Each structure stands twice: as structure tokens, then as C-alpha cells.
Amino acid sequence: TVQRLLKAVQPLLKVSMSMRDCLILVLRKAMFANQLDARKSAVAGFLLLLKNFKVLGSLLSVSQVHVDVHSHYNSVANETFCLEIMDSLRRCLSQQADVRLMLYEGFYDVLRRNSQLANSVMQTLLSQLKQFYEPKPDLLPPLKLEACILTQGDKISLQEPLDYLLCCIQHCLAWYKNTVIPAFYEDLDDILESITNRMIKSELEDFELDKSADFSQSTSIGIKNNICAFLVMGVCEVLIEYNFSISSFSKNRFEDILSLFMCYKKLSDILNEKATSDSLLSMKFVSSLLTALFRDSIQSHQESLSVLRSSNEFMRYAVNVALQKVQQLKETGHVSGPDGQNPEKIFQNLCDITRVLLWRYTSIPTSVGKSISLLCLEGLQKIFSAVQQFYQPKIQQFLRALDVSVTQRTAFQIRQFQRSLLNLLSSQEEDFNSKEALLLVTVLTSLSKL
């Protein structure tokens, strides 16, 4: 409720000066208060207060009166103010897992919107990560498995969400290297590369999770061993995302990412059948994976991309992640990863996701677990309803972005689905696939509403 209230009231914060100083004073007093769960809200206030305003801060007894002093503001003083208010957050990283979660999630926007603090946020992240990453020539489990777990009172919980940390430093390094350049950022990517090249070579027995050892949901070692699998799961996802973009297009990185997905999928198979969480792929990366995997056909990429295209399970994984993002948008108006609260970026990305899923279904119904085509059609079914529910004034722009007024475009789409429905209904029964016809009828309803 404090996060939602502050987000709602921040337009008044944007244009004022007395209000911002009052909030700063309240949050500063709340930080030093020894009562816990007060810091849990103080940091949540500070992230919003800092990731939206470039300059903040100013320019009692009865016997004292405030007076106006006409000193024009000193930029270096304000920069030192920001640096101190961020150093407080730097030493706030010895708390429970939720504060670490929201700090890791807010640092990317803090770096993006206040460019001056660039060379200190990364000296926070890089100096925190090295508590776990273990640099040597060869020690096969390169990330420390147990260093982020706690054992007090036999109520085992995790403190350091290592996956979220590594994701945050990944996005921070991407924004640093790609955009705002015109040797710490030269060392950090080498650290990341030495994480990949010794994580794909993990036997998965060097995490001591080789066989289905305990994995229970009730015992002592079981819950900890379960929690110590989601960390490596998220690390594998984020490392896939980075190793896509470390180099433009070469087969070596693609052998790396495919083998690392194999090491993800083996663990997911082991963990799933015995007894989940969301994925860590950024939304724009999901779109740039789908579009670059199905649609584009430039001959230079083809040699390397044939390796990633031949993994049938990888296709299902990618479309499942896209479907998960669409589902999260359907439930609430924010996707998980970055740009989650910015609606226009989600709309622009969703346009491309629709444009590529439509091509995948329509272009190749050759002979049609579940097949890929049904997953694509289910994604269309979810995403049209999402568009109609949330992006109401932009339906015309959405229909303009696919490849005259809205009604002719919608008639064309309904004809496209119409012909396929007729084609798969014309077959004699013999267990005809009724799921596709049923959800096609659902899509036709949701589209004929237009």
C-alpha cells in the first residue's frame, strides 16, 4: 500500500519543493528508526523518490523562525546529497530477502534516469556479487551454492536472490556498454563469461543435486534443496539472455546457450514431476528472440541459427515464456521485467509478438505434448482479449501495425481464421482435434466483437 500510494501521489511530488523535503525528512527518520518493517518501506520510498527526479532536496522551537536565503543551488552539493542517499542504500544490503528484491529491481531504473550515479551503482553491485562468485582457474561449481542460504531456528529461507542480482547487473552492463559509452566494465563482462564457461561445464553433481536426492516439501534438507534449485534455474535463464547478446551472431555462443538450456531443462524435468515461478527473460528479449527465430531469414545468420532451430523443445520453451508474459499482462497491467510499468513499451512489444505469432500459425499449417501451432493459437486467443481489455484507444494503431478503416482489417483477420476453421472442420471425425476448433471459435467471438 505504501508503494501504490506513493506512486499515485508522485505527480504532486514532481512539481513542488516543500513536499519533497518533507517526504525526504520523513523517510530519513524512518530509516534510523530501529523498528523493523519501517526500513522495508523507507527503501521503497527512496527508490521511487530517486528514480524519477534528477534534482531533489532543498536549495523546531517556538523562539525560532525560518527565513529565506537567496543562494542559488550548488550542483555539486546536490550530487553529494544523491551520493550519500545512495550510499545509505548500499549499506542497506544486509537485510531480509524482500528489501534485496526491491533494491535489485529498482537499481536499473535508478541507473537509467539519473546518469550521474552510474559509476557508483556498479561499484555497489560488482562489490556485492563477489561474495558468491568464486574466481579461480577451475573450481567446477563457479557460483557458491550455499552462501545465499540461512539456517536459524530450523526455519530455512533464502536471503540473497542471486538470480535477481545477476539479472540486474546484466541489464546495467547492457545499458552501460550499448548506449551511454559516448576498466571495471571491462572486468565485469569477463567475470560473467567465466561464469558461463564454467557453468555449462558443471556436472550438476558439483552442485550436489545430481540425482533426485531429497527434493521434499516437508523435511529439513528437502525445502532448502528445493530453494537451491530455483536459484540455478534463474541463473541459467539470465545467462541465456546475456549470452545471446554478448556477440552478435556466431555458432560458439549458440552451442553455449543451447547446452545451457539443456542443463536448465534437465533440472526442470526433475523438479516438475516430483511435486511454478515466473521466468526471468526480459520482455523485449522475448520479442527479439521470437522474431529472430521464426521470421528473419538472412543467410549470414543461418549457419549458427540452424543449431538453435533444431532443438524442438527450445521452440516450446520460447513460446511458453511469451505466453506467460501475455498472461501476466492479462491479470495485471504490468509485466515482470524492465519497462513493466511503462504501458507504451509493452504495447509496442506486444504488437511485434502478435505480428510474428500470426505468421507462424498462418504460414505453416502443414499437418495440423501439444504441437507448436496450438500454443501459438492459444497465444493469439489470450492476446486479442488483452488488447481489447487494456489498450482500448489503440486498437486502430494495433490493426495498422499488422502485416483503410479498422473494419476491413478485422474482416481480413476473421477471413484468415475462417478458412482454417473450415479446413480443419471439413475432415471426417476420426478424433478431429476439437481443442483448436473450440478456441478458434473463441478467437472469432473475441474478434467479431470489433
Nearest 5°: phi and psi at 158?
-90, 145
Nearest 5°: phi and psi at 143?
-90, 140
How far is Cα 262 from Cα 245, in angstroms, rounded to an integer? Answer: 19
Smallest gap from Cβ 18 to other proteins, in A, equals: 7
- Could you tell me if 420 and 365 are in contact, meaning their C-beta atoms sit under 8 angstroms apart? yes
Binding site for other proteins (CB under 8 A): 15-18, 55, 58-61, 63-73
- Could you tell me if 210 and 132 are in contact, meaning their C-beta atoms sit under 8 angstroms apart? no
Which amino acid is located at 418 in the chain? Q
Smallest gap from Cβ 45 to other proteins, in A, equals: 21
Smallest gap from Cβ 29 to other proteins, in A, equals: 17
- Could you tell me if 14 and 56 are in contact, meaning their C-beta atoms sit under 8 angstroms apart? no
Smallest gap from Cβ 74 to other proteins, in A, equals: 8
By beta-carbon proximity to other proteins, the closer residue of 98 and 344 is 344
By beta-carbon proximity to other proteins, the closer residue of 54 and 266 is 54
By beta-carbon proximity to other proteins, the closer residue of 61 and 272 is 61
Give the cell for residue 52: 524519477
By beta-carbon proximity to other proteins, the closer residue of 62 and 183 is 62
Smallest gap from Cβ 66 to other proteins, in A, equals: 6
By beta-carbon proximity to other proteins, the closer residue of 81 and 390 is 81
- Could you tell me if 421 and 362 are in contact, meaning their C-beta atoms sit under 8 angstroms apart? no
Q: In 310-319, which positions are buried (b, 16+ CB within 10 angstroms) versus exposed (e)? A: eeeebbebbb
Smallest gap from Cβ 28 to other proteins, in A, equals: 14
Q: What contacts 46, CB < 8 A, 6 or more positions away?
A: 27, 85, 88, 89
Angle at 97 between CA 96 and CA 98, to 5 degrees: 100
Give the cell for residue 276: 511454478
C-beta neighbour count of 273 within 10 angstroms: 8
By beta-carbon proximity to other proteins, the closer residue of 50 and 232 is 50
Smallest gap from Cβ 321 to other proteins, in A, equals: 36
By beta-carbon proximity to other proteins, the closer residue of 17 and 402 is 17
By beta-carbon proximity to other proteins, the closer residue of 55 and 147 is 55
How far is Cα 147 from Cα 132, in angstroms, rounded to an integer? Answer: 6
- Could you tell me if 356 and 382 are in contact, meaning their C-beta atoms sit under 8 angstroms apart? no
Q: What contacts 203, CB < 8 A, 6 or more positions away?
A: 140, 210
- Could you tell me if 442 and 381 are in contact, meaning their C-beta atoms sit under 8 angstroms apart? yes
Smallest gap from Cβ 22 to other proteins, in A, equals: 13
By beta-carbon proximity to other proteins, the closer residue of 22 and 59 is 59
By beta-carbon proximity to other proteins, the closer residue of 66 and 155 is 66
Smallest gap from Cβ 296 to other proteins, in A, equals: 34
Work out the burial of residue 172: count CB atoms within 10 Å of its CB; fewer than 13 is exposed, 13-18 middle, 19 or more buried: buried
- Could you tell me if 353 and 287 are in contact, meaning their C-beta atoms sit under 8 angstroms apart? yes
- Could you tell me if 63 and 41 are in contact, meaning their C-beta atoms sit under 8 angstroms apart? no
- Could you tell me if 406 and 399 are in contact, meaning their C-beta atoms sit under 8 angstroms apart? yes
Smallest gap from Cβ 393 to other proteins, in A, equals: 20
